[PDB]
User: Fold PET hydrolase from Ideonella sakaiensis.
Amino acid sequence: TNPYARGPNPTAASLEASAGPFTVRSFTVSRPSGYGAGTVYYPTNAGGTVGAIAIVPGYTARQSSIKWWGPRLASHGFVVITIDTNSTFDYPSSRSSQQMAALRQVASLNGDSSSPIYGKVDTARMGVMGHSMGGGASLRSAANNPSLKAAIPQAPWDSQTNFSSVTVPTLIFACENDSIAPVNSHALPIYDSMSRNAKQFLEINGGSHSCANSGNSNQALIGKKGVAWMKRFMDNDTRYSTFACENPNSTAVSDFRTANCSLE
Assistant:
């Protein structure tokens, strides 16, 4: 039996719903260390320790742009920290350092008797997500920290596209009509550079640059795939292998690619 498995057996409906089975609470980090601000979302009743995920917004953006992931993931059994960066003008490398600092503070708070997440986190199981320059940050975090269990960059942007050293299971969300981080020069080549990992590419049909941000019209599909990816790879939960590795068969998807994804 998988010591990391949490929650009931998944269905398409359970993954497409606004919330998973678990009750979610949140709090603001009092003295953020290494980043600007943070909100921690956590399940109150997960039935065991859970992995943690740090999410970074893009340039000139704030927590609001990515915060829909907080409740969506936490309600399926993850601790999620959404952050503001030291400056909204920070570039990917700086964003990556702050993303890892956010994971470190979640791990420290796990050992803080006064924190709401005291003893709730399996601090060996961590993941990274982020939008555009925060997606580049997540890729840098994965390349520099191979012990990370999963990475989900959305509409990624960086000054380079070669992330060939990444061995972390990486799911890239791309927005077909993105004019800020065009898929042909960003998301697609970044996806194609990784030959050493489980990976996936899901492009949203007709999507603009913000197609996976808070308020998007595809939270059923995007949330299904993000939660399934984190379940399969952060929890080793093979109940989610089909949901994580399959073509979703959606008219909202204009391009789907995947490699080294079990599907068993």
User: Anything to note?
Assistant: Residues 1-264 form one domain.
